Amino acid sequence: NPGILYNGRFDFSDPNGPKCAWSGSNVELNFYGTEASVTIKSGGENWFQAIVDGNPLPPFSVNATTSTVKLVSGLAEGAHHLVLWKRTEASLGEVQFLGFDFGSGKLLAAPKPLERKIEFIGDAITCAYGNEGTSKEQSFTPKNENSYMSYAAITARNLNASANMIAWSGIGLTMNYGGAPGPLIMDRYPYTLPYSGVRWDFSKYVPQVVVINLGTNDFSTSFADKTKFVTAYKNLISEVRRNYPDAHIFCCVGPMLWGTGLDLCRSYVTEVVNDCNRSGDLKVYFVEFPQQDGSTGYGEDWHPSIATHQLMAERLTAEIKNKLGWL
Ligand SMILES: OC[C@H]1O[C@@H](O[C@H]2[C@H](O)[C@@H](O)[C@H](O[C@H]3[C@H](O)[C@@H](O)[C@H](O[C@H]4[C@H](O)[C@@H](O)[C@H](O[C@H]5[C@H](O)[C@@H](O)[C@H](O)O[C@@H]5CO)O[C@@H]4CO)O[C@@H]3CO)O[C@@H]2CO)[C@H](O)[C@@H](O)[C@@H]1O
């Protein structure tokens, strides 16, 4: 009867505890009692938030160490629902959950996994890099990367769907931010644990919706070559289609591109969607998030503020509802 729901790409190979890395990986459970504690090992500066009976609690970190943290306490004695959310992205380190403790209380039967499922594929925007920063000149701060208030997570909660957030700040299709060497998105996409080489079994999570927001890094400094960019994008779509033949795929642009980088990326992604559509695959769509204009502020290094994430989520929720007929 009692058990735990692991929402995300988790590796269960170590009997000492499940491991994960991607943004928004989360552990969901019911417990009886008045408090709950967890022991977490984290490879780098990871931040977490507990949401208990629908109340988000102050976030906390576990930084390149193993810590036992009392997540919540002083509750009325009874049954309670807990989501434990990894705020921070994969590059800030893998996380292993080494056990929960309920004091005098006990673990209850887990909620069932949600039937509606979304996979997001993206960069800093999807990671919600800097969304709790307060001005665009501020540099990255692990504590301010709140993926629970990413446009992705908000949209998933709007739709009562689970989401896997396969995203990595600075990553592109043809190049990484500023030409930085290293794996590109297709290189990292096949992994559960991108630093320790554990590959994901795609049959384990088949989403009805895939949301792709890539290309900001391909156009934010140097402009990627059109053929190279279009070919990389079609290759990603092919891989998604290989694992999820029936998914509805939303190809997104915005809201951080501007000027000619925005014009080119928009044009190229539109062309990719148009090409798929003329090829008979009618379940590939284009979405544009209007460029941010300062009126909802900026997060660190120009990345979207929570307010901008909420606008994006409003728009993406409507697009998904339209195409899937959800709600
Ligand atoms: O987790 C850590 C992670 O970091 C990754 O690298 C980060 C990198 O460290 C950051 O410096 C970088 O920051 C840049 C943004 O990516 C980029 O989008 C942004 O572009 C700005 C630009 O600087 C600014 O001039 C531009 O202004 C235009 C306005 O937007 C228009 O409204 C107006 O009309 O015209 C002006 C142009 O005149 O705006 C854009 C945004 O729209 O510049 C940031 C640097 O200042 O981000 C990277 C991640 O996204 C690293 O790669 C990872 O490896 C590492 O782990």
Residue numbers in the entry: 8 to 334
Can you provide the manuscript's text about this entry?
The structure of both wild-type CtCE2 and the S612A mutant were determined in the presence of cellohexaose and clear electron density for five β-1,4-linked d-glucose molecules was observed in the cleft, consistent with the affinities revealed by ITC. Notably, the O6 of Glc-4 makes a hydrogen bond with Oγ of Ser-612 (in one of its two conformations) in the wild-type esterase and Nɛ2 of His-791 in the S612A mutant, while O6 of Glc-2 interacts with Oɛ1 of Gln-780. Mutation of His-791 to alanine reduces affinity for cellohexaose ∼20-fold but, intriguingly, the S612A mutant binds to the oligosaccharide ∼8-fold more tightly than the native protein. In the wild type enzyme Ser-612 adopts two conformations. In one conformation the hydroxyl makes a polar contact with cellohexaose forcing the ligand away from the histidine. In the S612A mutant the hexasaccharide adopts a different conformation in which it is now able to make a, presumably more productive, hydrogen bond with the histidine. Indeed, the bond distance between Ser-612 and Glc-4 is 3.3 Å (the two conformations adopted by the serine suggests a relatively weak interaction with the glucose), while the bond distance between His-791 and Glc-4 is reduced to 2.8 Å, pointing to a stronger interaction. Indeed, the kinetics of inhibition are consistent with the observation that cellohexaose binds more tightly to the enzyme when it makes a polar contact with His-791 rather than Ser-612; when the serine is in complex with acetate (or formate in the crystal structure) it is not available to hydrogen bond with the hexasaccharide that is now able to interact with His-791.
CE2 enzymes are acetyl esterases (that are generally not appended to other catalytic modules), which are reported to be active on synthetic aryl-esters and acetylated xylan. All three 3D structures reveal a bi-domain enzyme in which an N-terminal β-sheet “jelly roll” domain (around 130 residues) is linked to a C-terminal domain of approximately 220 residues.
